[PDB]
Amino acid sequence: VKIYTKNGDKGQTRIIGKQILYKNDPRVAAYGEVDELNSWVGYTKSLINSHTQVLSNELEEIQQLLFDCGHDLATPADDERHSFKFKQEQPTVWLEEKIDNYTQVVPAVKKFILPGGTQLASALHVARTITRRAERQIVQLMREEQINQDVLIFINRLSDYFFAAARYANYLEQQPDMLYRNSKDVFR
Amino acid sequence: VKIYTKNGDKGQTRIIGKQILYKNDPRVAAYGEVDELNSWVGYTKSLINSHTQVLSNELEEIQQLLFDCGHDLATPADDERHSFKFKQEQPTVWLEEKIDNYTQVVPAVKKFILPGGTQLASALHVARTITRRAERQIVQLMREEQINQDVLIFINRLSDYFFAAARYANYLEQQPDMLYRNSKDVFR
Amino acid sequence: VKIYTKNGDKGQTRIIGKQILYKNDPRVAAYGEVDELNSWVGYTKSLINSHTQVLSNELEEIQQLLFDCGHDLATPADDERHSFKFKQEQPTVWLEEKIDNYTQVVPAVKKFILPGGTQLASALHVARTITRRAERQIVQLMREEQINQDVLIFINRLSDYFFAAARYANYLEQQPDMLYRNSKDVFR
Ligand SMILES: Nc1ncnc2c1ncn2[C@@H]1O[C@H](COP(=O)(O)OP(=O)(O)OP(=O)(O)O)[C@@H](O)[C@H]1O
Ligand SMILES: Nc1ncnc2c1ncn2[C@@H]1O[C@H](COP(=O)(O)OP(=O)(O)OP(=O)(O)O)[C@@H](O)[C@H]1O
Ligand SMILES: Nc1ncnc2c1ncn2[C@@H]1O[C@H](COP(=O)(O)OP(=O)(O)OP(=O)(O)O)[C@@H](O)[C@H]1O
Ligand SMILES: [K+]
Ligand SMILES: [K+]
Ligand SMILES: [K+]
Ligand SMILES: [Mg+2]
Ligand SMILES: [Mg+2]
Ligand SMILES: [Mg+2]
């Protein structure tokens, strides 16, 4: 079992189906960024402590979902042999219930917060912004190729999830959020 | 209060003013990368310990400044309703005094250093390179649209600040820097 | 000694040789991403503990090699004054022996694993995906300019190294890997 095949040494790689693409192709970038997010989520999960244990399981669940998302991003819409498997409905509602819960429990802001606080909250804000980077790449792909739009819906919602969870993480250790000092009242 | 509006589910988003852009638009990428840097800085700040407490306040200050920078990056130069608020002068001189101080105190190198050392120093080198990534995106934007050039000045200087602070962080725990073994004498 | 020259304040910068490029130029991005990887590796190394000490030296070695790689990426192929110095052969075989060893020792999977586990294993998966991001940028450069193809070979192999090392890191603390629940048997 050798994970190195050396077939990518010239800069091309296989997607799902028969097509090979350059490694910088917008599709390869899209699921590559999802993979980087997925690794970051694993890193974030590794920072869980006794105050923040309640977040551990859902972070693992998100990793499972990001594999499902990446699968579809790797799959051309006109590949006869492979189909999209990701359905946004249940995963996205699941995220929304957590955003709702976490928004309700934490102290309310009007103003932008500094992305920071505890190590876990800060890692969740990093997750938030990597998710947003991945989303930009998914949009890049979408503008050139037919994608499963369900992935974009979920990935969009997911960065709201990470924002909400980051604030929740601070709340779980009673670390106050800090406000952006020049912020207008932006959350309504 | 629902932070999820679902208006971005199709890949477009509002900037400051009335314009909507695709999420992968160079402007949205520019302030998105600034936001990722901002989250990283929060993460770096969360790693401060009793040896490195002297760096905590300025890292928070940098977060405030990155919100000011992102505001202007989000604002088209011909938006009648919104103006640039960021002025580079004082923030950049403030960075320069710290670069000066930190450069003076730490052991002098000629040669490239390995970006590493303590956890905080290493996080500061990560900050350095995320700042540089954000700067590249700001330049991408600048080549297509009129930006507040003050933001570029500050963001340029900021990666020098993170280099200097990373070396300072090592010095604060008396962790020696390691040299790149094939380095020419590059700092003069 | 002032590391800030202010010459890049307008968005252009020098490469090796006489050429100046915009900071978002594909070459500047390529070695800039290598620099971000290099900083991440330093961060990963800073997470080493008594269980994982055996990985510390090779991570430092990888930092040395990434400087060698970046040098060549910074060097145009037709620069009369500067030459490529990186040779892939020995560094890449060195990576392969470690991939082999680490693959052999850890429990075998068929299926995709969640990128996660201990803090160090998770950081190694982050390294894996930053390496892959850098590789995409190196390919972007290659499609426009003649590069030292040895760098691409090594950088390709390196993300396999980080995958193998991440699994090894889990094994060193006896943290089980978790499988992607919808994975097909992909490793053969
Ligand atoms: N740099 C990269 N960024 C994102 N995705 C990649 C990258 N390289 C390959 N891929 C995708 O992820 C899968 C696994 O990567 P892998 O390294 O095995 O591919 P490869 O580089 O083509 O092969 P090899 O590394 O054996 O030469 C590939 O089949 C491809 O779909
Ligand atoms: N992926 C992204 N990367 C960077 N910036 C973004 C991204 N998506 C939106 N933005 C910018 O940041 C602000 C807040 O993001 P937000 O998620 O609220 O926007 P949206 O995705 O358009 O809306 P929603 O998530 O409610 O559907 C936006 O108004 C826009 O200026
Ligand atoms: N944002 C960036 N991303 C990646 N590489 C960069 C970036 N800016 C400069 N470089 C490269 O790295 C080297 C060091 O960066 P440095 O900040 O010293 O350059 P500069 O911005 O042109 O100068 P200064 O910061 O003094 O105005 C440069 O010579 C150039 O090769
Ligand atoms: K491989
Ligand atoms: K939102
Ligand atoms: K500089
Ligand atoms: Mg959104
Ligand atoms: Mg500079
Ligand atoms: Mg490969």
Are A144 and A26 spatial neighbours (Cβ–Cβ below 8 Å)?
yes
Is the shortest distance between the CB of C7 and ligand 3 below 6 Å?
A: yes
Q: Give the whole-angstrom CA distance, residue A171 versus residue C133.
A: 34
Q: Which residues of B touch C10 (CB under 8 A)?
A: 149, 152
Q: Delimit the domains of chain A by residue range.
A: 12-188
Q: Count CB-CB contacts under 10 A for residue C4.
A: 20
CA angle centred on B87, ends B83 and B92, rounded to 5°: 155
Instruction: Express the helix, strand and coil content of chain A in percent, nearest 5 each.
Output: 55, 5, 40
Compare all CA atoms of chain B with the CA of A122 and give the residue at the minimum distance.
B43
φ, ψ (nearest 5 deg) of residue A142: -50, -35
Q: Give DSSP secondary structure letters for chain C.
A: --S---TTTTSEEE-SSS-EEETTSHHHHHHHHHHHHHHHHHHHHTT--TTTGGGHHHHHHHHHHHHHHHHHHTS-TT-TT------SHHHHHHHHHHHHHHHHHSPP-SSPBPS-SSHHHHHHHHHHHHHHHHHHHHHHHHTTS---HHHHHHHHHHHHHHHHHHHHHHHHTTPPP-B-TT------
Is the shortest distance between the CB of C34 and ligand 3 below 6 Å?
A: no
Q: Give the whole-angstrom CA distance, residue A138 versus residue A73.
A: 8
Q: How far away is chain A from the Cα of C122, in angstroms, using its nearest Cα? A: 5
Q: Distances from the Cα of B117 to the Cαs of A77, A99, B158, C4, C52, in angstroms?
A: 47, 38, 20, 23, 16
- Please tell us whether the domain made up of A12-188 is placed in CATH 1.10.443.10: no
Kindly list the protein residues that place their beta carbon closer than 5 angstroms to ligand 7, a single-atom ion: A 156; B 8
Q: Give the whole-angstrom CA distance, residue B120 versus residue B56.
A: 11
Q: Which residues of B touch A130 (CB under 8 A)?
A: 36
Ligand 9 centroid to Cα of residue C30, in Å, is 17
Size of interface B-C (CB pairs under 8 A): 107
Q: Distances from the Cα of A166 to the Cαs of A35, A102, A118, in angstroms?
A: 21, 9, 9
Q: Which amino acid is at C76?
A: P
Ligand 5 centroid to Cα of residue A160, in Å, is 5
Q: Which amino acid is at C83?
A: S
Ligand at shortest distance from the CA of C28: 3
Q: Which residues of C touch B151 (CB under 8 A)?
A: none
Is the shortest distance between the CB of C14 and ligand 3 below 6 Å?
A: yes
Helices (H), chain B: 26-45, 56-73, 89-105, 119-142, 149-172
Supply A45's token pair.
Answer: 């999960």
Cited resolution, angstroms: 1.9
Q: Method used for this model?
A: X-ray
Of B1, C36, C94, nearest to A133 by C-alpha is C36
Q: Give the whole-angstrom CA distance, residue A10 versus residue A155.
A: 31
Helix or strand holding residue A179 (H, E):
none
Q: Give the whole-angstrom CA distance, residue A130 versus residue B156.
A: 22
Nearest to B39 among A126, A137, A138 (CB): A126
Nearest to A28 among C96, C136, C152 (CB): C136
Q: Give the whole-angstrom CA distance, residue A15 versus residue A28.
A: 8
